[PDB]
């Protein structure tokens, strides 16, 4: 990022803006699977919404090389990138 911030400003969000920040919707209450200790599909830890676990790896195992940057796997939908995005992509919930 550019090194030049004149000033910071804060405000209120909007549902039409909170939908913009988000990468998926968490709709299942469940966290990581108990057996294998991988995250559970479409919940508070899943790789689809947030990020892959190890660096440059999808979920099912159809890609574990580094040659493919930025591709989205069509069998499970995770994206092979650095695992550091695992702390920059935000979820969203839609309340009835």
């Amino acid at each position: 990022d550019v090194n030049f911030f004149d000033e910071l400003r804060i405000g209120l969000a909007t549902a039409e803006d909170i939908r913009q920040w988000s990468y998926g919707e968490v709709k299942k209450p469940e966290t990581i699977n108990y057996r294998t200790l991988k995250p559970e599909k479409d919940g508070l830890f899943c790789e689809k919404i947030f990020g892959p676990t190890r660096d440059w790896e999808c979920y099912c195992g159809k890609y574990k090389r580094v040659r493919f940057k930025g591709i989205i796997c069509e069998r499970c939908g995770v994206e092979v990138t650095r695992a550091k995005v695992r702390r920059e992509r935000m979820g969203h919930i839609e309340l009835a």
């Binding site: 990022d1 911030f5 004149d6 910071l8 804060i10 209120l12 969000a13 803006d17 702390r87």
Partner: protein, 1118 residues
Amino acid sequence: SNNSVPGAPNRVSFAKLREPLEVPGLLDVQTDSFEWLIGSPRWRESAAERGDVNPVGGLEEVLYELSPIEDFSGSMSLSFSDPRFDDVKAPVDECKDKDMTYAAPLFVTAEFINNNTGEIKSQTVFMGDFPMMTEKGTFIINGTERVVVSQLVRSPGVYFDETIDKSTDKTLHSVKVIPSRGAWLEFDVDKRDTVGVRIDRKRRQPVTVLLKALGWTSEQIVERFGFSEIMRSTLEKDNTVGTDEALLDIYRKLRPGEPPTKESAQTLLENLFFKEKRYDLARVGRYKVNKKLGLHVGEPITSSTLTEEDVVATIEYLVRLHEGQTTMTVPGGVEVPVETDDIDHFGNRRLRTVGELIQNQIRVGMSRMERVVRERMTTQDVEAITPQTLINIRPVVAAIKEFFGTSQLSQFMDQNNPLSGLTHKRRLSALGPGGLSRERAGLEVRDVHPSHYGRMCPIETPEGPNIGLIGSLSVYARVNPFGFIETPYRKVVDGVVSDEIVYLTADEEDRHVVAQANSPIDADGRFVEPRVLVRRKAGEVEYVPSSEVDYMDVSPRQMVSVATAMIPFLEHDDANRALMGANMQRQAVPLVRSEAPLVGTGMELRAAIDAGDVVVAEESGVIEEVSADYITVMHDNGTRRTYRMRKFARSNHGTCANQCPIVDAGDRVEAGQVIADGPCTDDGEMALGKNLLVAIMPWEGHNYEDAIILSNRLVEEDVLTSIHIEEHEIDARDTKLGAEEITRDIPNISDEVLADLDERGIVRIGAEVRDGDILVGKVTPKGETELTPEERLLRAIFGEKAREVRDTSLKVPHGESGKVIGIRVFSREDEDELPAGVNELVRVYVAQKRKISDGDKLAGRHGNKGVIGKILPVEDMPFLADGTPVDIILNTHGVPRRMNIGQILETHLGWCAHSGWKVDAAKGVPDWAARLPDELLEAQPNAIVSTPVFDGAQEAELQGLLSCTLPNRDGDVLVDADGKAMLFDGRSGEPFPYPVTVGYMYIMKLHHLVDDKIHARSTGPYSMITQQPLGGKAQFGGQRFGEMECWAMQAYGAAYTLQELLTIKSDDTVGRVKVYEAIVKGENIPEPGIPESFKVLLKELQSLCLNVEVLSSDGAAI
């Protein structure tokens, strides 16, 4: 021989006064208490001496208060009495060896009453193992030597007070009867002139309410309290009229909104203060209440709960305290004085020691056992019940084992040397479970109180934030049954001093007039002068005509501790430097050789023999054969006693403990004589340092600002070498992936590195280990992942499989070296007790030998610390007219600033002890030596003198001793009448232009060594969650960069340095990786930008539905 000890080497003494009583066994406080708790004949004999009509053990008392248990039918019951112990499981040394606890098993004789049947069944119940105290006064929990510390609390009792009012400008007298355990009662006069009682921090009600509530008719109130006006006014001001109306009132102010019955109120008033189980005074509280009110002084009351007559006596006393009446009398009671109490005075501060403290845990655990027994006797059948089924041993075993594990007051024994341990056991601690907090204790609780004189040392205390909160028991002081500290006096009936001595407490002493041990005495005991100086009441000193003198002090050093007692010329220092001196002596490292000090106090033979680290001889006999390992003595009886000497034990604080047979073979040894020399002891004497030739001057700024110049001769001769013994421990614990193992081969380590280990996996004994080396070779079964393909080709070209095991081998931390002296292993097959889930534990001992050098701390005895800033080579030290070079050069500028000149006198006297002297006694005795003892007229070179505390060499006597020093083996005399000598400069070779003061001093090597206190860290291992460098001196953690260092940075204007510290040097992982990489690569370090932490602050503010955008110069977002 004036000294009691059989074969003690004798010190001529500058003692002017004969001591009436010899100093008691120093570890008495630690042994007596525990002897009382177990219940032993020795303690029974002591109670025979006191003449106590009640002989009871601490365990026996806790068994009376529990027995008998009964079911609410009363149809089944269970009581038990008469504890008895057994032989200890094993001897002490084996327990230090095998990691177990030296204890003894313990039974009781319990019985089960039955009413409807009429048959009572008795049997022997076992009650786990019980930790027992050794003769040294210490506990061995889990193989380590621990120590229970005595604790200072306020006793139970009745404390009157007077507090000034802010609104009406007039003082208000409030009482509190504070018991041992039970509800607080309290009475108080008001600014509106209205008495109010307050029961368990309830809302005040009128006090004639409770008075009427016990059963006091209005007429009896009128006649008993009639003379008092504020009590009468409070009998008007009350509203509730009648008995039950007041029990109902008390229930209605006890809790609001509860159904008020007359029977439940009358039941709770006698349930909270007169029920035996719910509320209790101890013997301390009961005795003290009796003594303060002057009622029931003749008979010993076994009942230990509050009584009603007592409460009426208290309210009459409070009204008396408002009156200003000196004397009260109660019907049925002797007369007493009337004054407000003081919580600081030592007659109110009782002290509860090991016996009381272990008794409390036995009690609480016992209660948790009693509930279980009560439910268990209700459920089981009357025919199939035995006293075996009811009692459950487990809940008490838990309580004790958790006391010795967790309780604040059972610490690791401080074992730097003998003096440190002996001091650790005599400690009076104010902190802990059941006392005032550290933040809660006001600034008055922490300072000296005129009643500590002779019980608690005013000088000795810790220096940090626990000042005043830990004192030390004085030399002669001893603790009586109830829990007060007593000091012995001698009594002067009519100006003549007796030989019989009485031990007084702090509150009994306030009632007489005590004269000090320097009063001039005839040979009859007749007072030499008309007026004596005396201490009267509290904090008052005054002259008195010789008839008003009741008591007198035992010894002029009655008011100091045991560590303070070993500071020659202590009345010449100030209290600050005296404090650092006492404090510092208990951090001296024991050397490889010991010598006793040429100038010392009479205290060190006694202290050494008591602190328990010299081996004494039990009987009298003749030495059979001497080993390095054991001494065998032949009694005159005919039976032989063999004593072991533990050789190089790792004491608790990493220093070494060594015992050395001192007697020669075929000798006659008296009973109770020293036979071996523990660490720090020479010839049976507390030797904490060495004698060194010191010269006082500045020397070309190498000792400037309190550093010290050492002569190289010390490092070559090994005068200050020590032995430090380490230990490291690693083990083989099961994980679900598999069971780890300790085995010789280790993947990817060459043969040379593994040469030291054997086939077992542990390093052989005596192989010098540089750090990073392997001591124990262990491998965890590596977590089963997939074998990496890049690693399949890398390992494929060579053909080496990363097995199912990673390498977690014990390694040598950086900064350690030495030999491997001994290893030790625990297995499941050996039948060793192991922790739950680990199969073998392995420890390894590494012992190095430290020579002194730069950056080690030295200290004299008067709190003159210092670091060694230089070590000159032998031929540079300023040397003496006969070519002896001095050893240490202590600067001048710190003597007159500290305001402690005891070190200069210690140096002068020390030089006189070195050379020996011969007064001019042919012409006659010169005047300055009139009162000099006869054994002192003439000493042989290197003779060890003693100068006690507050009674040593005077000035004129010292100055006169410096004129008679024996001339040197060359013929000449080296120091003049002043104590100054002529020195030659080692580098220049000229003589210095003035005389410098040389002489001897006693210097000790403290426990702040540069090898411990050095850590550096370029990178290391981080912590997953805080993501900062992992702290610790043992993992070479990184050193912390607080907030005032940032304010310094910003006052400089150093933007880039501070931004660098705060970001890539601690938090940002990306940053640290990039900087490390760029440094190894040899390119510029990246210019510091925006922390990765920023984006996280924004993701969290974006989590709270706030919306944060960044504005550029122009005003557009980014």
